[PDB]
Amino acid sequence: PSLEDLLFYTIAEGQEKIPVHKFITALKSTGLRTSDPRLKECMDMLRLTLQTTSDGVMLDKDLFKKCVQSNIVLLTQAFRRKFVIPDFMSFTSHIDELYESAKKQSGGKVADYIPQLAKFSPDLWGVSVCTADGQRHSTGDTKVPFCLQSCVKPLKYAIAVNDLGTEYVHRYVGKEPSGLRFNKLFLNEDDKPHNPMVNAGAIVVTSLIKQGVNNAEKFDYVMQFLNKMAGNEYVGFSNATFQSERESGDRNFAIGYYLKEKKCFPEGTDMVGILDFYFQLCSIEVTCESASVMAATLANGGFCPITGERVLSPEAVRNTLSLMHSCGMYDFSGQFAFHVGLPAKSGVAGGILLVVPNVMGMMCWSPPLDKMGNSVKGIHFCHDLVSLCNFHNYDNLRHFAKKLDPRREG
Amino acid sequence: PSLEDLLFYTIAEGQEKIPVHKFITALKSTGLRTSDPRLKECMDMLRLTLQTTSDGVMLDKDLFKKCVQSNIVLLTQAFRRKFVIPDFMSFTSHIDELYESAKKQSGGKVADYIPQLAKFSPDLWGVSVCTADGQRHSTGDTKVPFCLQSCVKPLKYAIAVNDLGTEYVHRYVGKEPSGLRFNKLFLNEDDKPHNPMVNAGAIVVTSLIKQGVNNAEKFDYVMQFLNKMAGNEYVGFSNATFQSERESGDRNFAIGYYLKEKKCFPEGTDMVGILDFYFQLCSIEVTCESASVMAATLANGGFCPITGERVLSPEAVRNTLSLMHSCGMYDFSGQFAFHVGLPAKSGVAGGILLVVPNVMGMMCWSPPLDKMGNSVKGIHFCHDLVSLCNFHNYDNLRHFAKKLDPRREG
Amino acid sequence: PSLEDLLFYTIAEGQEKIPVHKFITALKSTGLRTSDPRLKECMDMLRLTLQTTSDGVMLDKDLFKKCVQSNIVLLTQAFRRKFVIPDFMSFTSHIDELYESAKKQSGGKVADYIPQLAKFSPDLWGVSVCTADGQRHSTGDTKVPFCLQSCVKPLKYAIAVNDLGTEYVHRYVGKEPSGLRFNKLFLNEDDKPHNPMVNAGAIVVTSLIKQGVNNAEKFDYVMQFLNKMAGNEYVGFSNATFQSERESGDRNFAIGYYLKEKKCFPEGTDMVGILDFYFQLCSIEVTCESASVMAATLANGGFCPITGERVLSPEAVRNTLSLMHSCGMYDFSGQFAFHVGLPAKSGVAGGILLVVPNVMGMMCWSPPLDKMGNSVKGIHFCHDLVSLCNFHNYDNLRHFAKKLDPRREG
Amino acid sequence: PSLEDLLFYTIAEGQEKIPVHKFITALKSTGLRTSDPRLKECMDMLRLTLQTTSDGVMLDKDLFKKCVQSNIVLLTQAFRRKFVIPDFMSFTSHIDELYESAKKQSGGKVADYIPQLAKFSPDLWGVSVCTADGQRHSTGDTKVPFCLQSCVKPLKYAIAVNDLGTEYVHRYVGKEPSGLRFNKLFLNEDDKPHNPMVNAGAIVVTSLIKQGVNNAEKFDYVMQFLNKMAGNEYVGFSNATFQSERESGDRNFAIGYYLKEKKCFPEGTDMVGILDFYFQLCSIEVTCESASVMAATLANGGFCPITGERVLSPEAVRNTLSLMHSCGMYDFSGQFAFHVGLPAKSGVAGGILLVVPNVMGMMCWSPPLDKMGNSVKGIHFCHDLVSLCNFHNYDNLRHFAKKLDPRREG
Ligand SMILES: CC(=O)Nc1nnc(N[C@H]2CCN(c3nnc(NC(C)=O)s3)C2)s1
């Protein structure tokens, strides 16, 4: 009995040889991308043999196993439908239907307050999926870079807890949400900000990351860390946006100085500096696709699904999904956790970084925001998703009414 | 082949005939209780043939088949380790350790608010587990009756969504927590109570159940409902507590009038009569055991696990688990939601109604309260549980560090 | 020299005999009403004399002195222009224009929450003046009985602090205003209602008066007190208003319950009767004329200006004038102090009971209210009054611009 | 007849010639100060004849003529007991008693957040009186200089309203006290600061004085005013304090940024520059004596009582006294208006600028502050002072019980 030869027949169709193309589409339909980091060695040995014998391009039992043995455990789970969503082909057809269903939601205003977002077209709309198993799908403008803005807040929160610990970080920032008209306060009853998803707390989380090092290396570190999360897909920086967020954050200066007077930063902080760090962190660039991996890294206990590398300690990822669930969507967090149940984070550029724990992570992007600050199509999507799929945090996996369960076969 | 036959060998140990007590001990080790209502036909036949043959006592292939023909589906998956917690014996040893660690935390004051909760001894402490499959276990003072008090708030809420739907019920009561010092207000900004787990929201929810009918038939309605949730285990009513909780609820009368003034009850409400129904529902008795089935019903999408009967819509069990999450523990709901992640509701008798969605329902009961209103041992047990098992709503099922996962074998 | 005779010459104007009306007119143009209690002996000896010798009807040095001697100090001051307003004849002209400019101010809604405030016409409008010397003037509808409503709040607080003293009284009630979105709260952080001009605090004041006797004598005591405050002018009761005010005070009961549960009342209170007692007090009836005398007892150190009797301790009248300055116009209290700078109390029936300390008291009444609860005309007239005369509480009495002073002669 | 002639006999006491020192002691017992700027011609001419005839030194009716013609009117009101306080020598014995009674109240903490306030001894304690007529008295450390700090707030508010009128000024700053625990919020519901006596309201006012000019001139403009209000007595400036005030003013900067974001300043407002100018205005020095004349200009309709000069518009002085009464004493403002009922303003250096309209103004200085911000001896002195005299805003000038009234005689 042999792992590679068995798989060779399950694709062989009883035929004596396997065309190369007939393998590459058989792969793409499990949800995997040929470019997958975990797959390169199987792909390099396809790049190899596609010059040696140009008179093929068939694969022996030998030649197949020549390419596939390095990555056979993960190749077999794909082909025996062990992936978390087994029939991935159907599910993306629903992601597409759900996409077009939101793509018609024309209302909302593009953030005007800096020119770099006022220049983005309200017509843009991309949705990118990434499972805890690397199965990927995209619809729309999913390769257009845009800023995280406050989609970075849980990411840097995860970074800080990962390095310093729950208990150190939660001397400096609370861990609840404030109250639907405690929106305007900075500090709770203990003179910490209310949670790391609000600007008072985020500006505080930022002063914890990589202390004793200067602000340009601090940035490189967070760039390094965000890189491991998206498994080395697009992570960028628009100096443009950064300039406008610098000239115009009289509010964050207001918050910052209140925090300084009231003694909430760690001993030896240079407040005005980390306002600059914080402005930088918000002008970090992502695509739909690359962030959906960051999102799937949270969905997977802190292990990147396209690389398998442990990026975040399981304490940081739990902590974060806990605070996305209740402080994640500005004043809509309450109604959002009720009707959707998924930890999410929004951003004024139009981002919505979505986790479905133990299934997949997402990124949805339409620049027009509603009157509370959330992507109009973004919100309309997440509702439609939970509507359709028993992905609500407090659905029941065994008795789930008429909703569809993508983890199940038939 | 034949199911009963195959199960027969699974227990036969290659022998020709199984002793009854061998069959019994094999059944109870799966955590099933022989008293199970899904098993009554199995037991009714064993009890009868161990009459019609004092000649024994020993079942042959065809004699064991007469007994288990009727409950075979459930007997098989009990023996084929197909329950949610497959190693139920090892899990209950864990519960006993957690219980016995909670049991050394003698802090807290019991509720002397009325002569009936001050009558309960501080040394009482009990935990009842009922899984979504029916596997019971308890240790401690698990058969003492105590009033639900505010542990009934999610139960009554669930019934009102179950009968009226989400839209109707949430015309009358909000969805979100209130804010760690908006605990003294009744209404939120739309002049609705903040959510169904606060006194003012519970009362308004009460005025939605089974309108037009007198308070007697209302009460019967809610009890015949609460019986189906507990699989017809103990659901009682204390009159001693009801008479106290009416001569001494000045503040619910305070809330009751503020609500009428602000036009929060449905048209044709009798406000004082509904305070009475309110005082009543709080005086309903459960034991630890009867209530762990109640919680278990919400852990199971609305189906009572020990009877298989559908007690609540999935839409009402979802809403209840969402609002228990965030608003379920008075002023500790934020800290609980962070450090525990399970839907939970607390009373002043010393109850804590616990749900692990898709796993089990629990009910812990120690009378003495901490300064926030919560059973001291209860809160200790619930932290101890989540540190041990990956049940925190935001643990990963795949990567979970030092924690045991009782959903798995080895 | 002699005091009766000198006076007699002053009004004689050198001629041998004074007619009867020529005196009565000379007396009225000082603003004393011929029916002043302190002139009875005089007016009596005048109605005696005006039957004896019908062949006059004129007096001489001897016979004038026969009538005026008993009342010669008061008659003289009036006639040597010693009264606080020397030229009271022009002052009432200005009070007429002020009344005409206000009856032009046609807006506002008459209170309709009960059928007894809604029956009144929106064109009823009256002002009544009464000085620290008893000079009287009225224009409009000043003898129409109407209901004090929250105008009674200072009058009972005065009775309260008169009988037991500032210190005792303020163990149950704060002494500031609360803040312009603190109006729905009942208690400050000491768990006392914020001041006696709010319904939370009024209700608590009410519990303090004549404790230990029943609600009939209690009301009688207050009635007797209010008689002495108005020099026995019209005071009454609307059993009509009191009935529909008790069937509708759901908030008032809401308050009463809250204060009970928070133990805001003195030992041995029957809360539900204090609300009955309080409802009654809010239906005490007055006219513009009678009530402006109550305000004149407040302007005058506690002595009723038309009887001479001490009715309130100079301690109680200060504390009340204090808390009408800051708390007496509901949410318009802040603006009203700023601009009018006079202590007033408004109530929902359309009355404004206004003090100009050390000068005069008023009552303005016109039932159409505005969107903070104040008589529209009554408000307008108040601004106009202080735009005219240096009566504003922080006006200079020596360097006061083009403002007009009725206390100065020329 | 001639004014100097008869004023001569009132001092002559029959004799042919008045000793000059006799005349002076008669003139100082009216509480006039021989330095008084309205008496300068008289004191020059006394010295000149004390030169031109050592031959003496005693004034016949004709040489006394030669000296007092210049300032005769002021001198006669002073010698004919026509001043606001006729018996000034008695009053000052009282002011000493109360001063000596506060001197025993040794509690509090000297403000030490900067080293220029910790520099002052806690046993420093001064009071200085100046009437509307320029009668003077001081006892204690009344020539020591100290910074106004928040005492400057009403002085600049008055400047801005005098220069701009009420309506314009109150576009940028409301006019009510916030509410006894909305002390941390910066703005009221209209996004204006609460009033001109809170650190945020003071700041925006500062932005309205003399817009369009640099800070050096703006300061020169403001100190022009102050010198006039104190009759050109000591007005100075601690640059040592302005330095420490700006280096430590994190919350003031926190405030300044917040106000810029909510567009609270006039267009074209340099926010950091307005902040500098704010720290300057707070570092302006006075002594008890010089600052008692500031206060007195407010008691006096805007006229400086010792120069006769018009400094502030009656509209400006009204609004400032109104806002001092309700907002001037930090969180003590509610209780201070109740129990003292005088327009007063405290500061962190220990001063309390105090006013009795139509009588006098004061400055009580003692560096130790209480837990609310107020001089321990200052608050003590004002309580004692008004228990003694009928100066409480709502005392009666006719029936004032056993209080002394320094405005009458026998
Ligand atoms: C928009 C909105 O929220 N309106 C309202 N919602 N709820 C309310 N409750 C009122 C009844 C009891 N409440 C008090 N609670 N605490 C109090 N005293 C202190 C010191 O806090 S009074 C006020 S008013």
Ligand SMILES: CC(=O)Nc1nnc(N[C@H]2CCN(c3nnc(NC(C)=O)s3)C2)s1
């Ligand atoms: C209607 C309106 O204007 N509301 C507001 N006014 N000002 C605001 N700005 C915030 C910045 C400083 N503030 C804080 N003060 N205290 C805090 N912490 C605690 C425990 O209270 S945060 C408030 S929001």
